Every structure is written in C-alpha cells, then in structure tokens.
Design a protein around this ligand. Structure first.
Ligand SMILES: *[C@@H]1O[C@H](CO)[C@@H](O[C@@H]2O[C@H](CO)[C@@H](O[C@@H]3O[C@H](CO[C@H]4O[C@H](CO)[C@@H](O)[C@H](O)[C@@H]4O)[C@@H](O)[C@H](O)[C@@H]3O)[C@H](O)[C@H]2NC(C)=O)[C@H](O)[C@H]1NC(C)=O
Ligand SMILES: *[C@@H]1O[C@H](CO)[C@@H](O[C@@H]2O[C@H](CO)[C@@H](O[C@@H]3O[C@H](CO)[C@@H](O)[C@H](O)[C@@H]3O)[C@H](O)[C@H]2NC(C)=O)[C@H](O)[C@H]1NC(C)=O
Ligand SMILES: [Ca+2]
Ligand SMILES: [Ca+2]
Lengths: 346, 334
C-alpha cells in the first residue's frame, strides 16, 4: 500500500548494485597493474632480443634480433604512453563515479535500514513484508549488502549488475504499491505527505528524489516511482545523473587490451617499427637476408633462437641461464649492460 | 531548538568537505600521469646514453655511457614497478575513499535540501534560520556546494578542509540546539521521535546516524550530536569509518616523489645499478675521471651535446628507440 515500508523487492536490487560498485576500484587497480605487466613483458622481450644481438654481434641473426628488439621496445613505449594518456583517466574516472554512486546508494540504504520502530514496522522490510531486516556482518536480511567500501585489492573487472546497456536489475516497475510497498509497515521516508510521511505541519513542497535520483517520493499519499535504468543513453543534468555517469565511465573502459598492449600477428613488414628501421638503417629484400623470410613464421623462429640463448652463468644465481627462462626488466637490463661492456672492449 | 531544521553553521562545513573531496580523483589522475611522464624522461636519458655509447663504441667515455644508460634504464624500470605496485594502489584508494565519502555526504545534504514545506520551513536553512536555501548552479544559499562529482581533469587538490590532522571544520559542537538547529523550521529528519521527527506510531527503535556516521539523530526530543573529526586517529569499526578511510588515504599520498621517479645526487658508486655493474663487468676514474656527482654530470653533458641536432634536444621514447636501433645496426656493421 502507498506510504508503507519497502519490501526486499525494492532494496535488494540496490544492494546488488552497491556490492558491484564496490569492486570497481578493485578492477581499476587490476587494470592499471595488468597494463603495467604487459608493458614489462614487452620490455623483457626487447631486452632478450638486444642481449641476443650483443652476444651474437656481427651475424645476420643478430641483425634480425636488433629489429625484434626495436619492435618490442616500441611496443613497451606505446603501452606506457597509452597508460599515461588514456588508461589512467579511464580507470580513475570509473573508480570515482562508481564509488560516488555507491556512496549515494549506501547512505540511502543505511537510512532505510535504521528507520524503524519495531521488529515488524519500519522502512526496510523482508521479502514478504513480515519483519524489518537487520544487518549482520556484510549481509542485510541474508542479502550481501555491506554498505561500506571494502579494502581495495586487485580483482578482475566484472560487469554483471551494471553492464553495457545499464543496470540490468533496475527495470521499470508497474505496480510499486503492491511490489515495493508493504501492507502495514510504517515508514515516513516512503512519502512526502504529513500524515504518514516526511511532512510535518503539511505536505512537502514537492516530490523528493533519493538514492541519486533513483526513487521519486511524491508529496501525496501515492506509491513511489523508480527510474528504469536498464537501457541507458547519455544524459546531462538528470535527477539520476550519478547513475548515468558510472554507467558511461564503466562502458568506456577498454582494459589493458588495446593494440598497444597486444602482440602483433601481421607479417614482419607490418610489425611496429620494422619498415622504418629497415629503411633508415639498411637502405622485403633486406628482410629475407636476416629472417630468411618475411612472415610471422620466420619471426617466431628468431624469437625461438633468442629464447633458447644461454647467458654467462656468473650473471645469474647458482638459476637457469637461457634468456627465455629469465624475466624482470631490471634483471635483464643489467645483463644487457654486461654484454654491452663486453662489446665495447672489442 | 531541538527537532528543527538545520542552519547553515551545520551544513556549510559538510559542503566544504564535499567540495574538497571532489578534487581527490583529480589529484590521482595528476599523480598517475606525472609518474608515467617521469618514467618516460628516465627512459629518454637511458636511450640518449646508449646512443652515445653506440656512436663512440670503443672509448672509455662510451663505457661510462654504458654505466649511465644502465642507471637510467633501471630507474625507468623501477619507476614502472612503483607506479604498478605503490602509486596505483595509493591513488585508486584515495579516489575511491574520497568519492565514496563524498557520495555519503552529498546524499544526506541532497535530502536536507529537498525536505521542506515552504520558503521558511524545512531541513536546510540559511545562516539565521530565516529561509530554506535553494540550489543554483554549484552553490546552495551562496555556499559552494555542487552535490555532484565534477568532470575529472588533472588537478592538485586543496588540503584546507581535509588535512593531515583530520577535518578541520568538523569540530565538537557544544550547543547544537541553538547553533545547529533553527528555532522554528520544521524538519522530520532532525529527530527520531514521532511528534516532530521520523517516528510514526512511536519513536524510532534507535538513534539514527547519517552522513556516514557524522551526525547522530536521537529518538528522543533532543538536539543532534556530531562527531568531532578534526583530530583523527587510525581506527577500524568506527561508526564514522568512511571519514577515517578518506583521511588516511589522502594523508598517505606521496605523489610521484618517491626515489624511483627521482634522479640521484649520490656519488657514482652509490647510484642505482652502478656497483653491481662495475663488479660483474669490470675503477670509475677510468671512465668518469672521478667518482663524485660532478664527474657524472660531466659525462651527461657529453651525452647531451652529442650530435646525431643534439641528443639533449631530442625527446620521446619511441623516437629515441628507433635512433638507437639505427646505431645498433651501424655497430652490427663492424
Ligand atoms: C634525470 O636527469 C637527467 C639529466 O639531467 C635528465 O635528462 C636530461 O633531460 C633534460 C631535459 O629533457 C635534457 O636537457 C636538455 O638539454 C638540451 C641541450 O641543452 C644544451 O644545448 C642547448 C641548445 O644548444 C642550450 O640551450 C643549453 O643551454 C645546453 O647548452 C636543451 O636544449 C633542452 O632544453 C634540455 O635542457 C638533458 O640533455 C637530459 N640529459 C640526459 C643525460 O639525457 C632526466 O630527464 C632526469 N629524469 C627525470 C625523471 O626528470
Ligand atoms: C609478446 O610476445 C613475446 C613472444 O614473441 C613474449 O615474450 C615471450 O614471453 C614468453 C613467456 O614469458 C617466453 O616464453 C619462454 O619460452 C621458453 C622456451 O623454452 C620457456 O621455457 C619459458 O618458460 C617461457 O615460456 C619467451 O621467451 C618470450 N619471447 C621473447 C622473444 O622474449 C611477450 O611476453 C609478449 N607480450 C605480452 C604482453 O604478452
Ligand atoms: Ca506487513
Ligand atoms: Ca527560524
């Protein structure tokens, strides 16, 4: 009935959203670290190729390794530029809009949770409208709903309750009076009228929106209305703008999956840096001299020779010595510097 | 008087915090981009040094440049590790904690702003408790108070209302009934009692906390209580924990100022990577004519003045990488 406390069908979808927004900072941290990890892997492959060219200086495969090294160095460089120019902004913006929306939702839910008069009458009711619900650990009436920002550790990004089209569980409600409102639980937050709602001497001046514009609370003895947020489009200045902002920011996320962080499958001439390096330093013809071909199969063969190349065993722990079994930028950089010292002495 | 709407002395301090928290994501973006930019500068110096060594391969100056290149390459590598592991965690945490707290505050303020019966009776009152305030643009009753998360662009945040000690404006209130509550504006959010407040058939079961535990609304006919947040201590499980979390996360920020992102003034033997390289590969006087910072900067000058027009005038990682690859090809000629 209008003006009565809210059964679980109303607030559980909000808990689900709040819980998923909690994971957006975790996914931002994951994505920033994943992008850094991919850069480091590119740099490692550049370092292995440069080491191979130092060890085998003066051979056609060494000159092939210089081309490989330059390629992966440029991949590492472009990943860092994309981290600076694009990913940083995307992940900060998703973290901020999601956390801000979660704060707006959680303040509303926390208010509902506390606004009660007994075990059977209050603003936050169970599925049948029988009892008011209580918070125990991170659950409310058995529903995961911490109403707090969890400690932030990296976690893979997931879009379940908030996805490409909007908030999947926040659909249009045709009969709020029976599906959201209980029959008898008293809740002054359910209405702006003064008899059973927020008004004191008289009705509120206007409708009041709550939870960042999700629920509209009339100043009359009528049921609430909710926004349908499951099929969103861009908007400005909406009463529910924080919902749109978080959706837009999450939708923009590309992760560490753009071309800068991905390895290239094209033929050798089409790989980053190859053609220009062959032009400036050496000038299809020049490439078969060093890869014995110009397709990805020959590139893979050079990478295999690079990976199987052992380094001097004094350079590693008492540890494998093949370059493909070594990882870590700083470690491979210091090995390259060792071989550049040897090269200079010659 | 107890159970009346809130004068500006109550909510303007919350606006001031809400506005300042708005810029914490901007500081996170600023710091992350600045860190990346510093890594790129380290890598440029590592590349210039390597190019110098390829051009002059066979001289002790080139051996010095190999040492220099290794140093800056390791600095760039270490900067990426710190960005990945420390700065990203710091700045995401400051962004999340400040934005979350700002949402808690803004929802509460937005509720007060709308809960009114007239131009003179409602939950959000002006300084003298005469008028209910209205929101126009980014101000409420003339107070900066957008109640929105602004578009995120790089910016260094203020530390006026949230600083090292806490929330300076959120001090203990000795007389809320007269300083916070108006004398006659009606506001059911000021109390949990049923006559003038949130209760319907009777008073609410318990006191209600609002604004992430900042304000406690009694279920009796008494004035609100507020938490003093101006001299915080690290705690957990507090009713006002979100305030603690954002204070701690902001206070923990170093910016892109840790050693990984910064050049070193130590003597050459103490610079990153130098001793390990000298030990394995090879004394510093044979290449730098000394072992103090002055001899390091001397070699850096030689590197910067080397024509390719001068290395010191070239910048950009990918550009300098392709130049280095050209001279490595040239070396492979010999
Ligand atoms: C860590 O320290 C490294 C060494 O200081 C930094 O690398 C240096 O970066 C600066 C700025 O990018 C470069 O300085 C440039 O030098 C050129 C050449 O200057 C000379 O020639 C011009 C023109 O004839 C003349 O006007 C000058 O007075 C000089 O006589 C300038 O044109 C540029 O404006 C700029 O000043 C250094 O060359 C470069 N050094 C090395 C060894 O690469 C590094 O960026 C620092 N790291 C961080 C993160 O800041
Ligand atoms: C882009 O592709 C390159 C390969 O062309 C990746 O570098 C490669 O990384 C793998 C795994 O880290 C290395 O594999 C190693 O192979 C040996 C073979 O015996 C095996 O024993 C090792 O346990 C390991 O599996 C491989 O050596 C290395 N290749 C080169 C040339 O360094 C690179 O990581 C890729 N980039 C990204 C972002 O994934
Ligand atoms: Ca019922
Ligand atoms: Ca008054």
């Amino acid at each position: 009935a209008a003006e009565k406390g809210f059964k679980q069908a109303f607030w559980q979808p909000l808990c689900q959203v709040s819980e998923e927004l909690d994971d957006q900072p975790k996914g931002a941290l994951f994505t920033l670290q994943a992008a850094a990890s991919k850069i480091q892997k590119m740099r490692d492959a550049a370092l292995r190729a440069s080491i191979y060219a130092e060890i085998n200086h003066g051979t056609n495969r060494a000159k092939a390794a210089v081309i490989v090294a330059n390629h992966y160095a440029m991949k590492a460089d472009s990943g860092l530029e994309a981290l600076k120019q694009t990913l940083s902004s995307q992940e900060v913006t998703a973290t901020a809009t999601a956390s801000y929306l979660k704060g707006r939702i959680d303040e509303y839910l926390n208010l509902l949770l506390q606004t009660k008069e007994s075990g059977t009458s209050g603003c936050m009711m169970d599925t049948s409208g029988t009892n008011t619900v209580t918070k125990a650990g991170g659950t409310i009436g058995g529903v995961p709903c911490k109403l707090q920002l969890s400690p932030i550790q990296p976690k893979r990004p997931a879009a379940t309750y908030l996805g490409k089209a909007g908030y999947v569980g926040l659909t249009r409600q045709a009969d709020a009076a029976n599906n959201f409102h209980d029959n008898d639980a008293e809740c002054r937050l359910a209405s702006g009228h003064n008899t059973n709602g927020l008004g004191k001497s008289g009705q509120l001046s206007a409708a009041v929106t709550m939870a960042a514009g999700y629920v509209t609370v009339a100043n009359s003895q009528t049921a609430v209305t909710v926004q349908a947020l499951d099929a969103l489009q861009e908007a400005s200045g909406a009463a529910h703008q924080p919902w749109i902002d978080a959706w837009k920011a999450k939708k923009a996320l590309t992760g560490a999956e753009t071309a800068e962080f991905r390895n290239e499958t094209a033929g050798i001439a089409g790989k980053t840096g190859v053609t220009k390096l062959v032009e400036e330093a050496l000038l299809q013809t020049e490439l078969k001299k060093y890869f014995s071909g110009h397709e990805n199969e020959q590139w893979t063969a050079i990478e295999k020779l690079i990976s199987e190349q052992p380094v001097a065993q004094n350079l590693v722990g008492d540890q494998p010595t093949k370059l493909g079994e070594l990882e870590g930028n700083a470690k491979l950089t210091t090995i390259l510097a060792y071989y550049r010292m040897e090269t200079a002495g010659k």
